[PDB]
Design a protein around this ligand. Sequence first.
Ligand SMILES: Nc1ncnc2c1ncn2[C@@H]1O[C@H](COP(=O)(O)OP(=O)(O)OP(O)(O)=S)[C@@H](O)[C@H]1O
Ligand SMILES: Nc1ncnc2c1ncn2[C@@H]1O[C@H](COP(=O)(O)OP(=O)(O)OP(O)(O)=S)[C@@H](O)[C@H]1O
Ligand SMILES: Nc1ncnc2c1ncn2[C@@H]1O[C@H](COP(=O)(O)OP(=O)(O)O)[C@@H](O)[C@H]1O
Ligand SMILES: Nc1ncnc2c1ncn2[C@@H]1O[C@H](COP(=O)(O)OP(=O)(O)O)[C@@H](O)[C@H]1O
Ligand SMILES: [Mg+2]
Ligand SMILES: [Mg+2]
Ligand SMILES: [Mg+2]
Lengths: 258, 340, 319, 337, 327, 255
Amino acid sequence: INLLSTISTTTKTINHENINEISKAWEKNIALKPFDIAHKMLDGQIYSDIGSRNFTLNDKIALYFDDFDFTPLMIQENYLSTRPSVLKPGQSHLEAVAEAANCISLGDIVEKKIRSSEQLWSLLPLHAVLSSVYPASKVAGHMAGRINFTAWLGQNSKSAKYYRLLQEIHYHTRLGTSTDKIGLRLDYLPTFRKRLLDPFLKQGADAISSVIEVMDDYYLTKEDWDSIMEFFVGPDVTTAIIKKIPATVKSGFTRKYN
Amino acid sequence: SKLAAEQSLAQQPWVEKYRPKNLDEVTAQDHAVTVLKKTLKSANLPHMLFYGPPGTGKTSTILALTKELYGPDLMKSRILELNASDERGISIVREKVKNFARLTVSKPSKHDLENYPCPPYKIIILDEADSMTADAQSALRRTMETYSGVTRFCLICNYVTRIIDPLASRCSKFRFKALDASNAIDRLRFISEQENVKCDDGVLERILDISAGDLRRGITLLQSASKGAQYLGDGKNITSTQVEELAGVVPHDILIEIVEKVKSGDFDEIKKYVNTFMKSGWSAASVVNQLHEYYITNDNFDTNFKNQISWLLFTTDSRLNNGTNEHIQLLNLLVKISQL
Amino acid sequence: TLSLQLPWVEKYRPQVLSDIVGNKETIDRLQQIAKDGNMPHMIISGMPGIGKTTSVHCLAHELLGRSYADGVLELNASDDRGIDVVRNQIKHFAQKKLHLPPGKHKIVILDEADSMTAGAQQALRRTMELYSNSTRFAFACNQSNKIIEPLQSRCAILRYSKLSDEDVLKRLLQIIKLEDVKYTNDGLEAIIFTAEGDMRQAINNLQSTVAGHGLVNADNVFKIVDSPHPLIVKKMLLASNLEDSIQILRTDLWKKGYSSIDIVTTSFRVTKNLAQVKESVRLEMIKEIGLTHMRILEGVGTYLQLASMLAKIHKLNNK
Amino acid sequence: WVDKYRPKSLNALSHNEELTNFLKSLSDQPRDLPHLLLYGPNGTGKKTRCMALLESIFGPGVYRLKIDVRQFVTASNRKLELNVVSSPYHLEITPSDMGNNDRIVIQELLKEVAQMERYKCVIINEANSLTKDAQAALRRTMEKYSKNIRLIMVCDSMSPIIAPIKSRCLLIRCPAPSDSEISTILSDVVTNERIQLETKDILKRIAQASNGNLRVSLLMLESMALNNELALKSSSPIIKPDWIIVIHKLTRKIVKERSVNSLIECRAVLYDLLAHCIPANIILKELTFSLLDVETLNTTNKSSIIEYSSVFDERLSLGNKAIFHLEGFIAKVMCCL
Amino acid sequence: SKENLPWVEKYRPETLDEVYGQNEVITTVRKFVDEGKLPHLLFYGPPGTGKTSTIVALAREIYGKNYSNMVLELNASDDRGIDVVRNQIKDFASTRQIFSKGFKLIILDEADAMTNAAQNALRRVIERYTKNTRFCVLANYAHKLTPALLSRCTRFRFQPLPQEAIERRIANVLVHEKLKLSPNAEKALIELSNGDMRRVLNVLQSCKATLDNPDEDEISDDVIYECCGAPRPSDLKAVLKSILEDDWGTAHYTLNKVRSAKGLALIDLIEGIVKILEDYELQNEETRVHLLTKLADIEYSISKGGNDQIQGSAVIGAIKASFENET
Amino acid sequence: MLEAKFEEASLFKRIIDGFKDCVQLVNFQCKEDGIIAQAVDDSRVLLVSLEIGVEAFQEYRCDHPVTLGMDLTSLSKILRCGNNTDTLTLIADNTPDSIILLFEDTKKDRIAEYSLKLMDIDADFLKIEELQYDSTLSLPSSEFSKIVRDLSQLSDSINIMITKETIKFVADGDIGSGSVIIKPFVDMEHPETSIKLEMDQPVDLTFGAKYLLDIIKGSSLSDRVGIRLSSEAPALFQFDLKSGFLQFFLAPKFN
DNA sequence: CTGTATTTA
DNA sequence: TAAATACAGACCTAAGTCCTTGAATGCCGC
DNA sequence: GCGGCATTCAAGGAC
Ligand SMILES: Nc1ncnc2c1ncn2[C@@H]1O[C@H](COP(=O)(O)OP(=O)(O)OP(O)(O)=S)[C@@H](O)[C@H]1O
Ligand SMILES: Nc1ncnc2c1ncn2[C@@H]1O[C@H](COP(=O)(O)OP(=O)(O)OP(O)(O)=S)[C@@H](O)[C@H]1O
Ligand SMILES: Nc1ncnc2c1ncn2[C@@H]1O[C@H](COP(=O)(O)OP(=O)(O)O)[C@@H](O)[C@H]1O
Ligand SMILES: Nc1ncnc2c1ncn2[C@@H]1O[C@H](COP(=O)(O)OP(=O)(O)O)[C@@H](O)[C@H]1O
Ligand SMILES: [Mg+2]
Ligand SMILES: [Mg+2]
Ligand SMILES: [Mg+2]
């Protein structure tokens, strides 16, 4: 309505003849959502000669700068899940993804140098091309499946929570371990599982006293015992092992702790 | 008082026990201490920027200069020493440093004028200026040029490049030279005689050779050797081999075995020997340095081999400087120079 | 000396919409709006020195006549960007009673509107909505993206573009005619060339050249006003042989006092906006210039790093 | 049995006799003692040696330690919580439990013990995680207060330690115990703990499965005693920590199939490994060393793999996002093969 | 007394006739302030080229001996904020002078540090209050200034001082002090300056202190070199010559002995060698590419520390490998 | 050695509170005839010139001229450490450094010794202004402060107009306008209430509001203030003290 | 992009 | 039940300073 | 004893 009111003052009639200059001077320059940014950045037509002439590199940097907090994360998440259309003659998908990941590593180094001391924020344009534009250009093409949102935030939060839990466990057991956090995680835990959980599986409900004694020797707790079993992965995942333990044993152990 | 201080110095490590107190105790940095002594008779100290390798004695030199200038009484009233352990952001530089520079110099007493020159300016020492942010450095830049009448600024750093160009332009640049055997053998000999360190002929020179232009590390090495010899009580002299054993220097036979493994051997044997070698916990930098010395010094390899070995050693040293895993870098070095 | 005279930017600042040589379409739209009244809410955007502040000032003057003093609230948005300002002063001016002609409205000018804080920008929406029948808002900014989308939703959008060489030349010739200045065609071409579509910069350069040398000739203009810095850098990267690029870097840039950080930033900007070479070459060149810029920003900035930049770019161009 | 049978003095140490003699020499005069930096392979027992050195310098009450809680404020007005191990003669600080706020806990608290104080020992555990700003802050603090505060920094690698820090303290290397010495300690442990061995050689094999680590050796022995019910036979299986098997499966997947579809699975494995309190440098080291052990590859592949591992180790040391570099390393490895 | 200040501050120019190096700028500025047309100035240039000195001399010439009161001088050591702009700069521009009648002057020294918001608020203050006050922006770097602020001021690019002007300044200093300089020593002094008079004055006072005598002697190239620690040209060519044709062992020994005889720095020799080879006529560009890349990487690695002997051998090997392509 | 002994300790506090907001740093020049001080605002819009003669001091001894560079934000706190019934003593050694302030009670026995570190202000302050003005008026300080604080709310600019036996303060802002008109009258029943005016030429010029609010903060010293205006000249706001005076040379706005 | 909510065919 | 299009998935932390901005603290005035 | 205003500081955001 505002456009109609402003333009009709001079051009009493608006037609198909002048619509190009009407739209070109009234384009909605809004910051695209990170999903649309990832979709546009991973478009194989954009990096073609016609696309490069139309959508120049400055537009690519502006697209990155529309949301510079999530564009590198999305690009790193879903650059290896696109079917390429700009592969050089004699280059496979694996080579392009490897070069893209190398540029991703360079972009991450630049980002660390930016978001650290000395506040090298003038390097932001560099982080525009190293993290997003170049890796997308290496593996540009069509979207194979769906553009998944970056999972690095969730894994980071999970790792931080697990690190906090490990910090509590290590500071509880420091009286006996005299070993660092990583040293207790890598080596102490595969033995702690066998000292605590294995007797429940192999002896029934009569091994509660031994486990309680072992845990009180290292000042271990019920919440600490629950957190210990959540650290193991791979062939040793306790998410189903505890459920296989009879509920009577768990109730007796909880009563003994209480 | 003085007796308590002398006792405390006597019960302190040799690094601080023999810290220079006067400008004469600075042995090798003659070109800087000459200017510092000449400006003592005058009162035209400029802004100074000390830079050089660690352990060359910039902090000791500036402390001795400030002592000789102000005396033990005004040393605590006309000196503002800010280290790398203090907050030095923009707010700190604008508030504390600027207010101190704006303040007038403290009035010296009657005893100070009779024995010390007592210049009408005060000194703000800013040790380890590398960690200072560049905008704080610009605040320092414009602080050091308007109040120069009553305050003198002395930056001390390890890498001159970390300081902005205009700041290095306003301050007179003093480069502290690497303290190798030639210019520090006198100081090491004096220190050894002051502690009755009975050593062999080529021990102190070997100590400075392993030091690689660092008198602090050489002093610590001599101290450790002295304690090791005094514990034994055998009454013999410290040997060079005993010095390099506890200095982290790989023995010559192990180095020779490494050379044979690189020369003749495939990837598997080299990897096995590196895996066994890292068990002894040798420092990677020392191993790379010893490989460099052996390869460059020995005149049996072709020049084209020498170019590539030098470049590979440089690359590995640069990678190891930035907090990398020693075993991986050493294995990469050995494999890359094995294909040569 | 006792006093100075008004600069030609201010002395010959247009006071009517006809004296502006900017975009003909938007200027005619503004003239029609002023003639008819009922000025709508607007944001004018563009590059510095093309006639954005002047256009809105003359529009407000022509629209309000003698009532400009009590009907125009002109505030530099960067000067007053607090939400409290919008809450109190702008609101009070909006609710202020004023008997105006039946086609004229009170005008709120917000100069440098791109610097307003988010809080004031959001608070302005209901202020402009509830008093839209007696108070009108005209924003003047350089970047429309800095203004929130709802704020742009309620107003006309006027994208000013770079002035053509003909309009700048016509305004310059009018100024010379009104000032009686000795000039040369080459001098005016040089002034336009170093103006880069900024009328204010062209006028300032012309006035400074007249005050310093008296004759507007190409030699004098290039003596007092240096050629555009990005063009030397653009010539430097686009050299065919490494020797020529090193020579330009040594003579035109390094020996003339240009700092290393300025050189690397200019190279980054030129390669970003370059179009002669392909996309992959441009991205790889930006990679190398960014690596060198990372090296410079640590204080390693010397001539050797820039020489390495040019050598590595020429290796890249060497297939 | 990692703490049940552990030496408490210098005379109770049972390997590296030259190192024990050097410690005794350094502890003969404890008042004239420089700052110490104990470096060597992880799991060697250098913390036990520093504790024994402290027990030699002071009375036997050094091991009677307590855990206290201290609250600090950073530049963002945050409440950083530090758990500190204290003793009536020394205290231990581990700045590795937080992020970039190490310098803070470095500068203030040490001043607090430097201004309160013939000396009180300070043990910086895991000095590798110390940020360069924290090391710079420690640089002058180590020299200004040398008559009241002495540092004993324990690290597994001096590569991240800056040069001034190295020069300002004496350096002591702790070589990993030999397989014979590790076997002797294992024999003593199994004799005291009543563990049945049909042949001694089993213990020896544990040493060859520990790569010189004593902590790993004892914990693996404890892992072995529970499957075999306190009696170890000739073919007792070697129990590896779960992350080792995960990494080994990752190497098998890498050497078996090479594509972006497998790259996604490797990404998932890396995310799972990283989310469970495991450093990226250790992941890279173990992954590269298991990749090198694959007999299918030739020397041309192994040289490229080790070159990429070193390059991406440099990236990771200069980076902050672990996956952002681990994925690149695995992608380049897939490219090489 | 002025005898107490260092030579860097003792010899600060007080009038526009003592500001050497810049001629096309100084005469234009003098004409601007004599004819009255003084626009808003932007002095962009390297450190020590004489921007603050010339603006102070201009303000002294315009206002007299009471410069320190009629001119508002804001700098990086100040708050440089947006609120400080809004209050101080606006009040100074809007009000009149307390001591005399005339336009006012605001010198924003080192205004590259100024925040983007501050410059955004300032770009309207300069344009509005332009009939009674002027703005002068001094900057070492121009990229830190927004283009809108960049286009409101007349730009003067301060160039590094050429041979004749800095030579004249050293002549003035040797007139003021009971000092003499050797011609070759003066040439080396100019070469080691890179257009920075601050460096020249600092090292000149340093060698005056170094002379150790009451100054009946002359300062030769030896005094300058042993005071500033720069390599001699003779040692530079000797090191390069030993690297170029002599044997690896002999070249390494020569470099070590040159660098340890006078305690020279590797970076200084590297920069001297880069400067020296810049005149070498090379048939192809691949050798130059390799030389530049390897030397720049070596310099960057030196700027962070490491093994010094390894770095020197790396320089030797890089030069030899680069020139091995010149066959 | 400078040694000054005041009659009342609150008189110096009242003097310093006048400079508290408009001035940061001052250079006290101490001579045999009294203490002089001149300062310029951070924005360099107003100039403060204080002179206190030897009459205000119960005791005075100045062997040689002394320069005392000091910060007001600390001296205000130091003087606030005294009492209403105390006496103040300024001590400075031969070399100017760390001025000492002594508070002594006359009813009881108490010693309050405070120190202030001096600062070196390089800019000298010795200029004196002696020029005839177009108009010289005198009005009670309380009334002038009331008008200033009343009209400062309307706008940030206050215009003063002196016309034939008419004194006008105009303040036009965004919320409205205001005008206060006074006539010079002589009050025989109380002399400190009357308003005097001697004009040579009509004056009309505008000041900033906040600087006027800062100057009127000196009304706690004298009950009557003199205001001197001239064309193209700074305005002189003078509070006359018992031994000397305090004058603000405040600069108008460009038209 | 897949996937889903909404509108119109 | 299909076309036809909109259009939603998701929000990070340490860090450095500057800026805003609400709200509490602090003081003076009455 | 409130009433009002000014100052300061902490929380979030931006680069
Ligand atoms: N030139 C010297 N003459 C005599 N002793 C020296 C000299 N240089 C270093 N030392 C010794 O080394 C100790 C340490 O010197 P420092 O001045 O701290 O070294 P540095 O230059 O400050 O290195 P940093 O602090 O890491 S930058 C001194 O206390 C002396 O014992
Ligand atoms: N052209 C010149 N003529 C004479 N002396 C000069 C000249 N340029 C610099 N100097 C000397 O160098 C000193 C410092 O110069 P400044 O003008 O302060 O440096 P600058 O040009 O402002 O650059 P900065 O301060 O790093 S932004 C002066 O006090 C002079 O002694
Ligand atoms: N189209 C134009 N015609 C005439 N003069 C112009 C034009 N554009 C800019 N100017 C000159 O530039 C000066 C200020 O320009 P201004 O409109 O403030 O720039 P901006 O558009 O960046 O706000 C004015 O004095 C005016 O004379
Ligand atoms: N001299 C020794 N004899 C026997 N066991 C030792 C000796 N020194 C250390 N250990 C073993 O090492 C374990 C402690 O290792 P620790 O010091 O935490 O590893 P790290 O050296 O990585 O810090 C103890 O459980 C102890 O059994
Ligand atoms: Mg030091
Ligand atoms: Mg404008
Ligand atoms: Mg300057």
